[PDB]
Amino acid sequence: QAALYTHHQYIAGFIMCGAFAHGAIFFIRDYDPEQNKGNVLARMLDHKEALISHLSWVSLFLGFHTLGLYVHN
């Protein structure tokens, strides 16, 4: 049980990182703004600053609170 769960979870983590890496490779090599004009894909790059900022806020809040509660305990 321990070995199987750990094996599958680590493999899943590596595969997820690979998915995002290939997404970045798609943006650099295969993205065409002229063909994707106004669709959801172009709108992702349109408000990317908002997405990164909100992800930063969520990560900061979770890190500060989890670390604070652990140090307090």
Ligand X SMILES: CC1=C(/C=C/C(C)=C/C=C\C(C)=C\C=C\C=C(C)\C=C\C=C(C)\C=C\C2=C(C)CCCC2(C)C)C(C)(C)CCC1
Give me the residues that bind ligand X (CB under 6 A), please.
19-20, 22-23, 26
CB 36, min distance to ligand CLA, A: 21
Q: Which is nearer to other proteins, 3 or 50 (CB)?
A: 50
Tell me if 72 contacts ligand CLA by CB under 6 A.
yes
Dist. CA 53–CA 61, nearest whole Å: 12
Q: Which is nearer to ligand CLA, 43 or 58 (CB)?
A: 58
Dist. CA 31–CA 7, nearest whole Å: 34
Question: Are the C-beta atoms of residues 34 and 40 closer than 8 Å to each other?
Answer: no
- DSSP string computed for 25-37: HIIIII--TTTSS
Binding residues vs ligand CLA (CB under 6 A): 14-15, 17-18, 21, 25, 56, 59-60, 63-65, 67-69, 71-72
